[PDB]
Amino acid sequence: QLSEGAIAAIMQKGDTNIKPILQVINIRPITTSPPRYRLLMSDGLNTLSSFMLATQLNPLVEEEQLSSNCVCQIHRFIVNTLKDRRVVILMELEVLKSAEAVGVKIGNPVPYN
């Protein structure tokens, strides 16, 4: 299942030792130079919009294996605090279930604050 509470752990304790299972709700590019993908992710309990993808993972998006509704396991991530907002950069992951396998948004997660 999804790692409910992983988002809270990341935002509240900066816990980078966990390897959470998350669902991609949405992935979108920022184009300006290699694009940066931003992800809205769900841990089954909460959603959070401040995920970004390391550029090394861009081929997973560009070859459509990392896509909305897929389920991934995060193997390495960083949390930064911006000048103004915390952001989570996904450094290593594997796609456990394709978007097509999962099919729908899992549960009814609540937006994190």
Residues in the chain: 113
Structure-block tokens of residue 60:
């997973």
CA atoms of 82 and 72, how far apart (whole Å): 25
Strands 86-97 and 46-53: parallel
Q: Which residue has the tokens 């841990």?
A: 43
Cβ atoms 1, 71 nearer than 8 A: no
Beta strand segments in the chain, E? 21-30, 36-42, 46-53, 71-81, 86-97, 110-111
Phi-psi map region of 90: left, alpha, beta (phi>0 left; psi -120 to 50 alpha): beta
CA atoms within 13 A on the CB side of 39: 27
Residue (of 49, 39, 43, 42) closest to 3 by Cα position: 43
Q: Please, what CATH class does the domain formed by 1-111 belong to?
A: mainly beta
Cα–Cα distance, 95 to 60 (Å, whole number): 9
Tell me which amino acid residue 67 is. Answer: S
Residue type, 108: N
List the domain boundaries for the chain. Answer: 1-111
Taking alpha carbons only, the member of 40, 45, 37 closest to residue 9 is: 45
Give CA torsion, residues 22, 25, 28, 30, to 10 deg.
-60
Resolution value (Å, 1 decimal): 1.5
Which residues, in sequence order, are CB contacts of 58 under 8 Å at separation 6+?
34, 35, 37
